[PDB]
Amino acid sequence: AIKKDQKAPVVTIFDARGCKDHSNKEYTGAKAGGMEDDQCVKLTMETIKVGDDVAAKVLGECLSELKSRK
Amino acid sequence: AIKKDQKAPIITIFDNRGCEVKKNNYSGAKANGMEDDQCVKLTMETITVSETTAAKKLQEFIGLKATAINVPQISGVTKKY
Amino acid sequence: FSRVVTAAYVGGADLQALKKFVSEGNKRLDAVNAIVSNASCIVSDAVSGMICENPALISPSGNCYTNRRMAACLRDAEIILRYVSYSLLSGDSSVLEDRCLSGLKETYSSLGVPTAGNLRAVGIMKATCVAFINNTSQQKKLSTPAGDCSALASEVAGYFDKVSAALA
Amino acid sequence: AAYVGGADLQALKKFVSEGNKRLDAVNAIVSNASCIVSDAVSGMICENPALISPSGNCYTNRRMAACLRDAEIILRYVSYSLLSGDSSVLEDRCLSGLKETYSSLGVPTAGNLRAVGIMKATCVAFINNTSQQKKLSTPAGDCSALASEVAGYFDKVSAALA
Ligand SMILES: *CCC1=C(C)C(=O)N/C1=C\c1[nH]c(/C=C2\N=C(C[C@H]3NC(=O)C([C@H](*)C)=C3C)C(C)=C2CCC(=O)O)c(CCC(=O)O)c1C
Ligand SMILES: *CCC1=C(C)C(=O)N/C1=C\c1[nH]c(/C=C2\N=C(C[C@H]3NC(=O)C([C@H](*)C)=C3C)C(C)=C2CCC(=O)O)c(CCC(=O)O)c1C
Ligand SMILES: *[C@@H](C)C1=C(C)C(=O)N/C1=C\c1[nH]c(/C=C2N=C(/C=C3\NC(=O)C(CC)=C3C)C(C)=C\2CCC(=O)O)c(CCC(=O)O)c1C
Ligand SMILES: *[C@@H](C)C1=C(C)C(=O)N/C1=C\c1[nH]c(/C=C2N=C(/C=C3\NC(=O)C(CC)=C3C)C(C)=C\2CCC(=O)O)c(CCC(=O)O)c1C
Ligand SMILES: *[C@@H](C)[C@H]1/C(=C/c2[nH]c(/C=C3N=C(/C=C4\NC(=O)C(CC)=C4C)C(C)=C\3CCC(=O)O)c(CCC(=O)O)c2C)NC(=O)[C@@H]1C
Ligand SMILES: *[C@@H](C)[C@H]1/C(=C/c2[nH]c(/C=C3N=C(/C=C4\NC(=O)C(CC)=C4C)C(C)=C\3CCC(=O)O)c(CCC(=O)O)c2C)NC(=O)[C@@H]1C
Ligand SMILES: *[C@H](C)[C@H]1/C(=C/c2[nH]c(/C=C3N=C(/C=C4\NC(=O)C(CC)=C4C)C(C)=C\3CCC(=O)O)c(CCC(=O)O)c2C)NC(=O)[C@@H]1C
Ligand SMILES: *[C@H](C)[C@H]1/C(=C/c2[nH]c(/C=C3N=C(/C=C4\NC(=O)C(CC)=C4C)C(C)=C\3CCC(=O)O)c(CCC(=O)O)c2C)NC(=O)[C@@H]1C
């Protein structure tokens, strides 16, 4: 059943092959010996929130594009 | 010179031909024509981006690979400047 | 990933193993990347398309009147999109049905959140995600190696269909 | 707020070139403003990821917000230049003094040049209806002059910040 806490999984995909300037310290499991050592998936569970700024800007777009009838 | 109040013109385009809702924001002379159903709104307001939004956009950007459909690709993996 | 739902970092040998536990692991991760990295647009395009086709939704009588209501609607569309993105990552709809859809229709009925608008918002998001996966752009205008992702697209389409069925 | 409708709007349309088409072109920007800003700041960053490294200028929510904000400010003054048919307000209220502000803060020039370039390309595609999404319906015709005019406005931004 929905928890009514508005929390949802937030997935981030890091295809970091060739990137050197970030310290790959977040994954602490064994290495693959392959390209996956430069690749990482992150998952967190977060309260999904929408700021008033976005609510107002999306409304502003909407008001600029109500479909004409003719 | 920029005022450093971060205010910019917000323009809304109302082409509301065929809309049955009556609005009275415009107080000038009538067109007796299509422009009685059309309006341009202009305000000058502080442009605001919340830190909630900035956090959410960072998460969308931080993969550094995905794009809109059918657009040029310029992504990289090194510092350019 | 069950732990986090009920921060995880899967990389290296864990990621290598994860890819052999789902079908088409690499393409699946590309599809997730396309969806989550465009989430704000996907969500606002669906909610604003719902509205531009039925402007009464932001009339004083409409359910999306006021920033607070518009924010709640945009939020819900994003909640749905994220649980669909999780279903694509995990290869199944269990968490989507249990944590996103079970009890939602009754919640919307009690709130007066309109069914017609919800179905249209979901339907626009579905079409958008399917198009991101079945993207036939020329390679120079595509972030992934060009190829066939039609099976993944059908799978994501089915997850959106579970949303629509729960809300109708 | 100012509301220009009815006979005042007929006058506006007559006092600029290609009035009705110009409003379609303006609407192609403002009805897509959040996507335009997103593509520009995101592409700036994917080209140069150092911008969101722990020391980069877009690091932290406060700075990211300011950058997203500035891209929108620039975009909106360009949209106003297109509505009015000239760049006087853009130059006076958006560009004059902005390069020294950015130099004092350390806001990187090459980043602004990339963001502005993406915004220009995106606006031109929406105006000409060659974008992937074509949500605004127009009668068929040639809008290349309006597209070139807005391209000129973005180039004045680039010229002022370069
Ligand atoms: C706003 C989203 C959108 C919809 C919806 C639509 O239909 N088109 C949309 C966006 C759009 N983007 C461009 C052009 C560019 N976008 C980028 C940034 C992305 N490329 C990356 O590599 C990257 C990081 C991974 C991005 C994010 C770039 C670089 C361009 C090209 C800019 C240039 O100077 O040419 C357009 C214009 C497309 C066209 O010209 O046909 C549109 C419409
Ligand atoms: C915003 C994310 C995005 C990026 C980035 C990109 O490159 N394409 C993107 C979006 C996208 N949207 C659709 C389909 C639809 N979008 C809408 C809403 C808009 N249409 C309106 O009339 C309107 C108010 C004026 C809008 C806002 C609609 C209605 C659809 C069609 C849904 C359907 O039933 O088919 C797509 C799908 C591909 C396409 O071009 O249709 C995509 C990728
Ligand atoms: C038809 C598209 C429609 C239906 C159907 C519906 O239920 N609601 C509809 C439209 C609608 N309009 C607005 C807000 C504004 N409309 C404006 C247009 C004009 N104002 C005028 O004075 C004239 C005559 C020249 C117009 C053509 C303007 C300026 C609007 C904004 C007012 C403001 O600044 O607040 C909405 C939003 C909700 C509302 O105000 O009713 C809707 C839903
Ligand atoms: C290369 C693209 C790059 C340059 C150049 C630069 O200046 N910054 C660059 C990358 C970058 N990465 C990140 C954040 C994360 N990168 C992650 C990747 C991995 N972590 C690992 O352990 C492994 C091994 C399997 C990875 C491939 C992760 C997980 C990141 C998120 C960290 C978090 O959630 O806290 C950034 C953001 C800023 C930073 O932390 O460095 C940048 C700019
Ligand atoms: C439909 C989804 C789109 C499409 C996808 C496509 N991708 C590939 C190949 C690869 N994709 C990846 C991506 C990742 N692997 C990871 O571990 C991670 C980080 C978590 C990512 C982002 C990889 C590694 C590959 C292998 C090739 C490479 O090393 O670059 C293909 C090719 C076929 C295949 O299965 O390998 C395809 C078709 N292509 C499209 O056109 C659709 C829009
Ligand atoms: C380039 C921008 C695209 C293009 C535009 C195009 N538009 C028209 C005709 C009209 N455009 C409008 C738009 C508005 N008028 C308003 O008052 C408002 C609200 C403020 C809007 C949004 C209208 C009303 C018309 C019809 C005018 C009439 O009297 O019939 C054309 C036709 C040529 C012309 O100059 O009228 C064109 C070419 N078309 C494209 O294909 C490009 C993608
Ligand atoms: C947008 C497309 C539609 C719309 C949405 C709308 N929803 C609400 C309020 C609620 N939505 C939820 C949904 C969830 N809670 C969860 O925990 C989960 C799963 C993780 C979901 C999907 C809930 C619980 C509420 C009420 C409580 C709350 O907001 O915290 C609103 C506001 C309703 C009101 O009367 O205030 C709106 C506007 N509205 C539309 O018109 C579109 C069709
Ligand atoms: C984003 C593409 C780029 C970038 C942006 C960035 N800007 C700032 C700070 C400021 N920006 C302005 C700009 C204006 N103020 C105005 O009144 C107007 C005209 C209406 C404009 C254009 C100003 C005044 C500031 C400073 C004051 C303030 O923000 O309130 C920042 C923050 C700088 C800091 O160190 O805190 C940033 C990050 N940064 C980039 O990396 C991109 C190239």
Residue numbers in the entry:
A (entry chain C): 1 to 70
B (entry chain A): 1 to 81
C (entry chain D): 5 to 10, 16 to 177
D (entry chain B): 16 to 177
Task: Give verbatim excerpts from the published study on this entry.
In addition to their membrane‐bound chlorophyll a/c light‐harvesting antenna, the cryptophyte algae have evolved a unique phycobiliprotein antenna system located in the thylakoid lumen. The basic unit of this antenna consists of two copies of an αβ protomer where the α and β subunits scaffold different combinations of a limited number of linear tetrapyrrole chromophores. While the β subunit is highly conserved, encoded by a single plastid gene, the nuclear‐encoded α subunits have evolved diversified multigene families. By careful examination of three newly determined crystal structures in comparison with three previously obtained, we show how the α subunit amino acid sequences control chromophore conformations and hence spectral properties even when the chromophores are identical.
The crystal structure of PC630 from Chroomonas gentoftensis CCAC1627 was determined at 1.8 Å resolution. The structure shows a closed form cryptophyte PBP. This protein is very similar to the previously examined PC645 from “Chroomonas” sp. CCMP270 (RMSD 0.324 Å over 2732 atoms). Although the chemical structures of all the chromophores are identical between PC645 and PC630, a careful examination of structural details showed that the key difference between them was a twist along the bond between pyrrole ring D and ring C in the PCB attached to β82. In PC630, Gln6 in both αL and αS makes a side chain hydrogen bond to the nitrogen atom in pyrrole ring D of the β82 chromophore. In contrast, Gln6 of PC630 is replaced by Leu5 in each α subunit of PC645. Leu5 sterically prevents pyrrole ring D of chromophore β82 adopting the same orientation as all other cryptophyte structures. Thus, the sequence of the α subunit N‐terminal segment dictates the twist of pyrrole ring D of the β82 phycocyanobilin (PCB) chromophore and hence the spectral difference between PC630 and PC645. The α19 chromophore on PC630 αL shows a very slight bowing between pyrrole rings B and C, which is not present in any of the other α19 chromophores in PC630 or PC645. This is likely to be due to sequence differences in the chromophore loop of PC630 αL that result in the disruption of a conserved salt bridge that stabilizes the conformation of the α chromophore (see Section 2.8).
